Amino acid sequence: SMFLPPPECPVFEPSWEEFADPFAFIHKIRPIAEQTGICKVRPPPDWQPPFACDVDKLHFTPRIQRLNELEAQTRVKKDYTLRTFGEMADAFKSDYFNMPVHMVPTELVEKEFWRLVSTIEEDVTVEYGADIASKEFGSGFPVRDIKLSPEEEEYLDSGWNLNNMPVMEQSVLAHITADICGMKLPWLYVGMCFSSFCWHIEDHWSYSINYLHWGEPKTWYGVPGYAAEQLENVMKKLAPELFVSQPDLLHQLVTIMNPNTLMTHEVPVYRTNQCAGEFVITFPRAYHSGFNQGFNFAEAVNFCTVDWLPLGRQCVEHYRLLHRYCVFSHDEMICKMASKADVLDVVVASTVQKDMAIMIEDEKALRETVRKLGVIDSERMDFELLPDDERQCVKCKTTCFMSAISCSCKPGLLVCLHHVKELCSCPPYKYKLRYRYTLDDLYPMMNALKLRAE
Numbered sequence: 001s002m003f004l005p006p007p008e009c010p011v012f013e014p015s016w017e018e019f020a021d022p023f024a025f026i027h028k029i030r031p032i033a034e035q036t037g038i039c040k041v042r043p044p045p046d047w048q049p050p051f052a053c054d055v056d057k058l059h060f061t062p063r064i065q066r067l068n069e070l071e072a073q074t075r076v077k078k079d080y081t082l083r084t085f086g087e088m089a090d091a092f093k094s095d096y097f098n099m100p101v102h103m104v105p106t107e108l109v110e111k112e113f114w115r116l117v118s119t120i121e122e123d124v125t126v127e128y129g130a131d132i133a134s135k136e137f138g139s140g141f142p143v144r145d146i147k148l149s150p151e152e153e154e155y156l157d158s159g160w161n162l163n164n165m166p167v168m169e170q171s172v173l174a175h176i177t178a179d180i181c182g183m184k185l186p187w188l189y190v191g192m193c194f195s196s197f198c199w200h201i202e203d204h205w206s207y208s209i210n211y212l213h214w215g216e217p218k219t220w221y222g223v224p225g226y227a228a229e230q231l232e233n234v235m236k237k238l239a240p241e242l243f244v245s246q247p248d249l250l251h252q253l254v255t256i257m258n259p260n261t262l263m264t265h266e267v268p269v270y271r272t273n274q275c276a277g278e279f280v281i282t283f284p285r286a287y288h289s290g291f292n293q294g295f296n297f298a299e300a301v302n303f304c305t306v307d308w309l310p311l312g313r314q315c316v317e318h319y320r321l322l323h324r325y326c327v328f329s330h331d332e333m334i335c336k337m338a339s340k341a342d343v344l345d346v347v348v349a350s351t352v353q354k355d356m357a358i359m360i361e362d363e364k365a366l367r368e369t370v371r372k373l374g375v376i377d378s379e380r381m382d383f384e385l386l387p388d389d390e391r392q393c394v395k396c397k398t399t400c401f402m403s404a405i406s407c408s409c410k411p412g413l414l415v416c417l418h419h420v421k422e423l424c425s426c427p428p429y430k431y432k433l434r435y436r437y438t439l440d441d442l443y444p445m446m447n448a449l450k451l452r453a454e
């Protein structure tokens with residue numbers, strides 16, 4: 001009537017054998033899970049990482065949050081200990097419902113969440129924690145440093161220890177050298193009743209994996225990747241303010257929106273309650289949002305498999321059309337892998353090779369086009385040495401790497417090869433093509449990959 005809960009997303013209970021390799025397991029479930037955008041994974045009963053912290057020494061700066069549907073919020077960047085936050089959080093829930101926190105049914109919190117965000121008269125504000133690990137507040141998984149217990153040491157090298165999964169081999173984001181802290185490092189999330197994460201997809205349409213270490217559940221809504229644009233069109237119509245051009249990455253606007261509203265407009269939505277000890281995985285370009293049932297502690301990280309590579313290229317194309325800033329250069333990542341073809345996982349090498357072939361053909365065509373526009377002069381340029389904000393296309397903000405156009409008249413400015421007309425009013429013979437590699441450099445790099453893939 002008031003709120004109809006979306007159907008449940010798939011839940012997987014892998015055996016220890018199925019579970020041991022996270023990449024093999026994700027690949028196995030992908031045909032099912034990519035149809036629902038999110039899925040939940042219950043680890044084998046044996047898999048039980050140790051969770052030990054002193055709640056009095058873990059400190060973090062809280063973020064404040066208003067809870068009104070369709071209202072704009074900014075993507076995340078006063079002090080609590082984990083204890084005082086927990087005490088504030090439990091008191092809030094307990095007072096809000098006049099009940100002990102666990103006797104409040106999840107069904108009811110969900111129902112109440114969607115009531116209160118729609119009602120303009122209710123001005124509920126809540127607080128939460130969000131940041132990468134620091135010496136003030138570290139990962140909930142064991143990391144090396146302090147003598148570890150035997151239980152802790154068992155989980156140091158687990159493929160599901162989220163600290164590892166970036167730097168594992170079947171991960172592609174691994175040997176990106178350009179350190180992109182916000183995306184190779186796990187984030188830590190301290191939740192309280194109703195604290196929520198707005199609808200979004202991950203940077204570069206990557207996967208994410210989310211672990212609830214302890215506390216009350218996290219409630220999720222998820223939309224399959226194939227319906228991303230449907231969802232966006234629904235949001236444009238009902239909340240156009242979110243779609244105004246933003247000056248940078250730290251200004252992305254996001255919002256709370258009832259899944260029933262999406263379901264009404266024929267966007268498939270699924271839900272789950274994630275409990276302590278469970279994983280949620282989000283698939284490429286799968287929109288998701290949710291809220292916490294109460295006091296809890298989660299940890300999440302982006303990652304990119306070989307399955308993702310073509311989507312990663314499509315995403316950067318999509319960012320260009322939108323004039324959205326990139327977190328990293330996709331081509332730069334591809335070439336870095338090519339330059340390391342000998343030490344690459346062989347299935348990885350095979351997949352990179354295919355993306356690289358497309359990259360080279362597109363680049364060949366683009367260079368021919370700008371030559372026909374009268375750009376004649378050229379010089380090699382090591383783009384990877386430039387700070388990102390010193391190599392963005394003036395027009396579409398894409399991070400340049402394969403090539404760019406400069407002009408002596410606008411010193412320091414670049415455009416990508418799609419935007420040659422947008423740099424300045426000088427005649428194109430005054431322009432230079434700056435390029436990382438010649439085509440003659442590129443084909444041997446691709447050959448090393450092919451040999452490695454055999």
Ligand SMILES: Nc1cccc(-c2cccnc2)c1
Pocket residue numbers: 075076130189196197210288300
């Ligand atoms: N910025 C921000 C703040 C809090 C949670 C989250 C979140 C949670 C769960 C999945 N994705 C993102 C994101």
Ligand SMILES: [Cl-]
Pocket residue numbers: 067068069116117118119120121122123124
């Ligand atoms: Cl409200």
Ligand SMILES: [Mn+2]
Pocket residue numbers: 200201202208282288
């Ligand atoms: Mn997310």
Ligand SMILES: [Zn+2]
Pocket residue numbers: 407408409410424425426430
């Ligand atoms: Zn000029």
Ligand SMILES: [Zn+2]
Pocket residue numbers: 393394395396397398415416417418419
């Ligand atoms: Zn451009």
